Design a protein around this nucleic acid. Structure first.
Ligand SMILES: *[C@@H]1O[C@H](CO)[C@@H](O[C@@H]2O[C@H](CO)[C@@H](O)[C@H](O)[C@H]2NC(C)=O)[C@H](O)[C@H]1NC(C)=O
Ligand SMILES: *[C@@H]1O[C@H](CO)[C@@H](O[C@@H]2O[C@H](CO)[C@@H](O)[C@H](O)[C@H]2NC(C)=O)[C@H](O)[C@H]1NC(C)=O
Ligand SMILES: *[C@@H]1O[C@H](CO)[C@@H](O[C@@H]2O[C@H](CO)[C@@H](O)[C@H](O)[C@H]2NC(C)=O)[C@H](O)[C@H]1NC(C)=O
Ligand SMILES: *[C@@H]1O[C@H](CO)[C@@H](O[C@@H]2O[C@H](CO)[C@@H](O)[C@H](O)[C@H]2NC(C)=O)[C@H](O)[C@H]1NC(C)=O
Ligand SMILES: Nc1nc(=O)c2ncn([C@@H]3O[C@H](CO)[C@H]4OP(=O)(O)O[C@H]43)c2[nH]1
Ligand SMILES: Nc1nc(=O)c2ncn([C@@H]3O[C@H](CO)[C@H]4OP(=O)(O)O[C@H]43)c2[nH]1
Ligand SMILES: *[C@@H]1O[C@H](CO)[C@@H](O)[C@H](O)[C@H]1NC(C)=O
Ligand SMILES: *[C@@H]1O[C@H](CO)[C@@H](O)[C@H](O)[C@H]1NC(C)=O
Ligand SMILES: *[C@@H]1O[C@H](CO)[C@@H](O)[C@H](O)[C@H]1NC(C)=O
Ligand SMILES: *[C@@H]1O[C@H](CO)[C@@H](O)[C@H](O)[C@H]1NC(C)=O
Ligand SMILES: *[C@@H]1O[C@H](CO)[C@@H](O)[C@H](O)[C@H]1NC(C)=O
Ligand SMILES: *[C@@H]1O[C@H](CO)[C@@H](O)[C@H](O)[C@H]1NC(C)=O
Ligand SMILES: *[C@@H]1O[C@H](CO)[C@@H](O)[C@H](O)[C@H]1NC(C)=O
Ligand SMILES: *[C@@H]1O[C@H](CO)[C@@H](O)[C@H](O)[C@H]1NC(C)=O
Ligand SMILES: *[C@@H]1O[C@H](CO)[C@@H](O)[C@H](O)[C@H]1NC(C)=O
Ligand SMILES: *[C@@H]1O[C@H](CO)[C@@H](O)[C@H](O)[C@H]1NC(C)=O
Ligand SMILES: *[C@@H]1O[C@H](CO)[C@@H](O)[C@H](O)[C@H]1NC(C)=O
Lengths: 777, 773
RNA sequence: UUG
RNA sequence: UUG
């Protein structure tokens, strides 16, 4: 097909509509900007390389650049790899950017720069210098940024990237940047709010600094400000996972009552970790539009019981009062002020880490009439007692979250969220059952025993999360009787005792059941387990039974008219299917609608004959990955007449079938990565017209000849993976080298990991760049 | 040193006292008996190879052989590898053994043999033909075994190795084997006890067969028999993990009341899985010496409550009545007959799988006066209730085992349910004193009074319960003598630094696999709880996912071993955060620290300085370590063992001696090392063990590996590298061929990878004369 | 690779 | 390899 092979070690994309030529050289172990970058290049990304300098020659030809992303070519020592530390800061020579008349966005984050780079074109809207070593801002260094709208300067002086002094900002440094919308000075050891800021700011980020006091006029002119973040100034340091220095005398960040008076447009106020003890209502006198308020990680335990300020927040969407508990105090109950009832717009309330013994219905009465309330998060509260029936008054909610408690008789937050330093930190790369309906999340509690009356009045629930409790009982179909509407039960990380084949049958509308990581009782010999419990679940679509160490079953067959997906990863089918024992060879046969089966990680070093014949007739998607498979009778695929995806990754296979078409007419996706294949059979893919995806990566293949890979098949492939093999680039490889260079077929990692290993001369050389003319003399 | 390199791909060992020359060729991927086997060879082992034939030429020179072990050179299809199936049964030519005048023991197990091999010498005392295809025994084929004392014939016809007929034994086939002591016909599809057996038998194994009936005279003459095993005839098949066919009519193995009358010497009787419903006392009328009786996997639930037969067993040491429960019956309690009191010699009583709701003190009264009772096993009984205090009447016992029950206020894990627990392959806190094992119960909450009257306990096993409480040092008050607590696989909440402090005599604490509360942010954990445990020697806190700690230091005057595998020291030691760099410093007598599997891709500076002063043994394995500042080992002045296995290191120190003068054992296996530094081992005289296996080393020169060091090494591991066998390698190849230093796998995995000619060739066999022209 |  |  192609007349001119692509040798450039970067992905090139065309977006004809937006007039964009996108060149992505992310993480290509470059020590130089590569030659041959298209002249029409608009967006060039060189992040995570080791290019030690920029010069007028760097971008000479590239006069149409709108965006240069040159991040993380010299990451500060403690932020970067300890195996490849950058020896000297990036050097930017004069005039490197002044010729780029159309340049809108420049990212120079993570390059150990000492100063704001000069000579930047007046087109620039966005400049980013995070994770550098710039800790003095002078008005004179900013005159070049007349048109700048977005300026990121954070992470230039903090514990991971120290500068060993206070940050310095000259008076009025930013004032004459008349179009500046977004200013970020986070994580920078700043001691005062810099003034005067231009009145065009929409977003101001001042968090994780050393600001002890806000002056009453610090935000006087910012009548367009929408987002203000002052978090992590006078931090609450208890159990902090980073070095944390509090303000002296347990002082809060001191905020005058009239500090916010000019912020009539403010939508987001973030006061996380400011050691606040009071929230004066006078703060919010002139902010009628505030939508999001974060007051997490303070000392507002008393204030939550008073909270006059809430009367001024009728448009608030999101309130977070998490982790406000008094140290070494365990309150008897949660005292929510009546003032919460005035939060007419509230969709999301989070109050983790209040820390109290007993939740009772009346304590939530202030919320009964919040019509728009969607999420109530009372996680990580060490609640010992809670009658779940109280949530009958909360049918309108999408999520009731009691995760991480001590109870016994629409996006999830990262596992580190309230305690991390900077949850918005940008990486060097880049720049759940809620969907089923009403969710009650009781995960990570101390529930040892359940009975029907625990769920009295909760028939509206679509999802119940019981993950990570202590449930050890012989469920018999009597325990969830009220849960008539339940579509999803997550029962993972309990100790299910499957003595009874009637377990879960009362959940007549159950579509998905997760009983993964319930291995306990499956580890002891002589215990009766009824894997045939599936028969009674008439609308079950998906069953997850992973990591259960299942090596025995009293019943011989699982049956279902409905089940489409079975995850059975991390069990011991090798023990059930011991060579000579026929009894379990039809375990899955009567799952008549099953399409997806995952039996990876079952220590299946071989498959006894009868396994494939025993498969249910409509199996589409089979994983046998990570089994230590040392042999495989390819012909047995003939029994799986609807097989579309076969995953055999991470095994010990040494051969492919002589003729894949003769094994399976239906197979579309063949994953063979991470095996021990050293050669392909002569006619491997001959007439395999249905094949669309083939992964032969991370094998030991030396040679590939034309006969194995006919062109009428290769042309149908959406992707062919060949990387990390042992290719021999001798004159015997002429066809393969030619074909790789010239094909239109998508083959990933040509630039990094489709490499000759030999002979001598060409060792470590990309096959895409290989010249074999000496073979044609 | 050596003048003649050892090229034979087998270990050769000398035992001068017994005049033995031991040649072990186990698992050497041989397809031929190797040449050059010493002429003086007495014991030759060729197990797990693919040698397709034996012939007169096989052992011609080896006239002094006493033992040939030639097992598993052609394993039956379903018993063997499916990746290397044996194509044709072993072929044994005539006269292969008749020249071996001194041959005492021949093992030919696992070779797909169809017949008993003939032409065996009259010296033979032991013949073994397990896992063959010999399923008809003819008197004529046994005449050659006049002097045989031990004959193994089992596993020749069973579900893993089927013969598709009944086993056949001709009448009196064994009678004229006048010195036969041990006969094993297990796992063979035998239908009747073969008769007449010789009266010299000490041991008869007939288990896992199809014997429905014992005739009254089957064992008439066996007045020397010590062990009889008839188990697995009319099996109890409930929840069996193998294909199991019961006797028709739910029948037991039928044993007439006088069948054992002649067995005056019997010490062991095994009647496991015989579907017995009754144990007639008349069985044991003439056996006063029986010591071991296994009656597990029967239907003797009612019989346990009666059990008149026990009155005839005053010398019994070991009784097993495990897995005798009636299907779908969950008894209220355990009914032990008063007859148990007559078992004056009993050391070990096992009654798992009785299956009952509540154990009460009175129910064990029949045992109160068994003076020698050492082990009481009531595991896998689904007991819901048991007052632990009842065991105050049992201080004399070594182990009280309530493992796998349902209580709430060592045998292989498969034992009672496996087919043949004595099958031959081709190739714990009891020690501390009184042990109460409550592992795998449903204990959610504990308090001091649960342990009332149990102050004598030395080991308590609470492993695999549901304990989720903030232990505060009040919960084990009575357990004043406890030396070992296994608290693994619970949900310890380490809120309180006073946890466990009441166990004033605790030497070992295991709180491994208590990760639960360590997985959620904002929870207070006090790792400094070690301070209060004044005699603690060993602390195991593996697989706890520990990534946060309210306290900054662990302290102990006593602790010698800390296992901290499978945690998140990488998070505690984030580059820039100094606060936890002395976590272990104040464990002043610590000698062994295991911080493998802590995702430590690098070690921040200060880690080594923060190590306690007497550290001898440090594991940093399986951390994905990509770099390592070897010079920092200077801080570990007492370091003897450094384990850096399974990492991504690419280099060794320029000079190991300049890093550590104390280091004896350096484990670097499974890294990415491609070359050694020029002077690597110069003057590191006290180095004794070096493992460089599974790396990418191409060349090793004498400067890196001076001989004044290498010769002192007890072991040097080099296998699975990328050795380039050019003329540059002359020294290394010479030294490897000639050294006395132990180097494992020379015969199998110390290989050239090039150039061309020598690719895949063993370094030990490499001829490099062309380099010396 | 006699489980 | 800014968490
Ligand atoms: C190419 O560069 C331009 C400008 O740097 C990018 O345009 C930005 O796109 C994002 C989309 O998330 C918008 O939010 C910004 O407001 C745009 N800025 C400008 C000045 O146009 C464009 O995204 C880049 N394209 C690629 C593929 O990287
Ligand atoms: C933030 O600035 C403070 C000073 O305002 C820095 O603290 C100084 O650090 C040097 C070296 O650590 C010391 O000699 C001085 O004693 C410190 N002064 C004070 C007042 O504490 C601090 O290092 C800066 N933080 C970072 C991470 O760079
Ligand atoms: C070498 O072969 C002899 C002969 O088979 C072995 O000696 C026997 O070892 C068994 C195993 O415990 C003893 O119980 C016998 O009493 C020994 N004597 C005889 C004559 O059988 C000897 O152990 C073998 N040595 C090795 C290391 O394999
Ligand atoms: C043990 O012997 C029995 C016969 O007593 C074998 O069973 C016969 O096997 C063939 C083939 O499976 C059948 O056609 C016969 O009907 C069987 N006879 C009976 C009486 O069942 C059995 O296969 C043998 N067991 C093993 C493991 O080899
Ligand atoms: N798994 C299980 N959990 C129990 O709680 C139980 N109680 C009695 N039993 C009996 O023990 C036998 C082995 O588990 C089971 O078989 P059963 O005779 O039907 O009755 C069962 C229990 N089994
Ligand atoms: N780990 C733990 N387990 C508990 O059961 C508990 N109850 C209250 N608390 C309090 O919650 C805080 C966060 O773990 C702890 O700090 P405290 O305020 O000293 O008291 C503790 C508990 N902590
Ligand atoms: C709740 O707390 C506030 C503290 O401001 C207190 O004034 C109020 O009376 C408390 N109410 C209850 C029900 O405890
Ligand atoms: C839980 O509250 C409900 C009413 O919502 C009531 O029916 C039930 O009895 C309560 N249960 C307990 C144990 O308090
Ligand atoms: C249930 O909770 C666990 C633990 O919090 C979480 O990992 C899991 O994703 C949740 N399950 C669903 C279905 O959302
Ligand atoms: C299930 O268990 C409950 C426990 O109270 C019992 O009422 C019910 O009868 C049991 N179900 C069956 C099928 O026995
Ligand atoms: C499951 O199998 C058992 C036999 O082991 C049978 O008695 C029980 O009724 C079966 N249950 C279903 C739903 O098939
Ligand atoms: C096959 O199943 C796996 C999970 O087992 C899934 O990730 C994958 O997308 C499926 N493939 C197709 C083609 O549906
Ligand atoms: C495989 O190959 C042979 C020859 O084309 C043919 O006879 C046989 O039917 C084929 N089987 C399948 C399932 O394609
Ligand atoms: C357990 O037995 C002891 C006597 O050994 C007694 O002191 C205690 O009260 C008993 N516990 C219960 C709950 O009956
Ligand atoms: C405690 O019981 C567990 C679970 O059976 C067992 O694995 C462990 O080895 C026992 N602990 C000790 C210290 O022997
Ligand atoms: C620990 O908790 C116990 C049991 O609830 C409590 O009564 C006691 O005061 C505490 N003990 C110690 C040693 O602090
Ligand atoms: C452990 O550390 C905490 C504070 O971090 C302290 O309150 C406690 O007393 C310490 N305990 C011991 C035993 O050192």
């Amino acid at each position: 097909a192609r007349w001119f092979p692509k040798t450039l070690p970067c992905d090139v994309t065309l977006d004809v509509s937006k007039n964009h030529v996108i060149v992505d050289c992310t993480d290509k172990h470059l020590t130089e900007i590569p030659g041959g970058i298209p002249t029409n290049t608009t967006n060039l990304t060189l992040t995570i390389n080791h290019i030690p300098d920029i010069s007028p020659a760097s971008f000479h030809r590239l006069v149409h650049l709108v965006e240069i992303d040159f991040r993380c070519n010299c990451v500060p020592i403690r932020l970067g790899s300890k195996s490849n530390m950058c020896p000297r800061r990036l050097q930017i020579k004069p005039r490197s950017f002044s010729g780029l008349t159309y340049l809108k966005s420049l990212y120079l984050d993570g390059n150990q720069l000492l100063e704001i780079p000069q000579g930047l074109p007046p087109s620039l809207q966005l400049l980013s210098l995070e994770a550098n070593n710039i800790f003095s801002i002078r008005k004179e260094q900013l005159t070049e940024l007349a048109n700048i709208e977005i300026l990121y300067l954070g992470q230039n002086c903090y514990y991971r990237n120290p500068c060993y002094v206070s940050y310095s900002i000259e008076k009025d440094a930013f004032l004459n940047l008349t179009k500046l919308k977004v200013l970020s000075l986070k994580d920078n050891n700043v001691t005062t709010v810099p003034t005067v800021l231009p009145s065009t700011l929409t977003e101001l980020y001042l968090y994780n600094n050393m600001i002890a006091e806000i002056q009453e006029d610090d935000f006087n002119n910012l009548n367009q400000l929408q987002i203000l973040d002052l978090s992590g100034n006078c931090p609450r340091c208890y159990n902090a996972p980073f070095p944390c220095t509090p303000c002296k005398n347990n002082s809060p960040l001191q905020i005058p009552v009239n500090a916010f008076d000019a912020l009539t447009e403010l939508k987001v106020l973030r006061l996380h970790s400011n050691s606040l003890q009071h929230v004066p209502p006078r703060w919010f006198k002139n902010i009628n539009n505030l939508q999001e308020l974060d007051l997490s990680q303070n000392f507002l335990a008393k204030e939550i019981g008073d909270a006059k300020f809430l009367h001024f927040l009728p448009n608030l969407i999101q309130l977070d009062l998490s982790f406000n508990f008094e140290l070494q105090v365990y309150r008897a109950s949660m005292n929510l002020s009546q003032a919460f009832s005035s939060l007419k717009s509230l969709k999301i309330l989070r109050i983790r880490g209040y820390v109290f013994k007993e939740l009772k219905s009346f304590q939530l009465s202030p919320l009964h009439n919040l019509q728009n309330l969607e999420v109530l998060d009372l996680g990580t509260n060490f609640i010992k007692i809670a009658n779940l029936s109280m949530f009958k008054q909360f049918k309108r909610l999408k999520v009731i979250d009691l995760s991480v408690n001590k109870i016994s008789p629409p996006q999830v937050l990262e596992q580190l969220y309230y305690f991390r330093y900077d949850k918005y930190a940008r990486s060097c790369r880049f720049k759940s059952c809620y969907k089923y309906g009403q969710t009650l999340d009781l995960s990570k509690n101390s529930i040892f025993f359940i009975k029907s009356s625990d769920f009295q009045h909760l028939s509206f629930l679509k999802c119940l999360n019981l993950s990570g409790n202590l449930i050890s009982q012989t469920l018999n179909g009597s325990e969830f009787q009220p849960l008539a509407e339940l579509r999803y039960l997550d029962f993972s990380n309990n100790r299910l005792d499957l003595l009874h084949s009637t377990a879960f049958e009362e959940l007549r509308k159950l579509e998905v059941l997760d009983i993964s990581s319930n291995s306990h009782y499956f580890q002891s010999e002589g215990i009766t387990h009824m894997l045939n419990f599936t028969k009674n679940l008439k609308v079950l679509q998906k069953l997850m039974m992973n990591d259960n160490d299942i090596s025995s079953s009293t019943s011989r067959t699982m049956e279902s008219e409905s089940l489409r997906t079975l995850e059975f990863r991390g069990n011991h089918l090798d023990v059930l299917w011991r060579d000579g024992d026929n009894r379990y060879l039809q375990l899955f046969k009567n799952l008549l609608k099953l399409e997806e089966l995952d039996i990876s990680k079952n220590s299946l070093s071989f498959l006894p004959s009868g396994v494939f014949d025993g498969m249910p007739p409509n199996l589409k998607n089979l994983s046998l990955a990570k089994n230590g498979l040392k042999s495989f009778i390819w012909e047995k695929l003939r029994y799986l007449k609807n097989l579309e995806t076969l995953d055999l990754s991470h095994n010990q296979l040494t051969t492919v079938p002589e003729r894949l078409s003769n094994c399976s007419r239906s197979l579309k996706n063949l994953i063979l990565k991470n095996n021990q294949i050293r050669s392909l059979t002569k006619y491997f893919l001959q007439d395999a017209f249905q094949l669309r995806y083939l992964d032969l990566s991370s094998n030991k293949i030396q040679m590939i000849q034309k006969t194995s890979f006919p062109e009428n098949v290769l042309n149908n492939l959406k992707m062919l993976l060949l990387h990390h093999n042992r290719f021999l680039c001798t004159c015997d490889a002429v066809w393969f080298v030619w074909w790789v260079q010239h094909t239109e077929v998508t083959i990933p990692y040509l630039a990094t990991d489709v490499t000759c290993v030999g002979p001598g001369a060409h060792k470590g050389q990309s096959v895409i760049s290989l010249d074999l003319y000496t073979c044609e003399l």
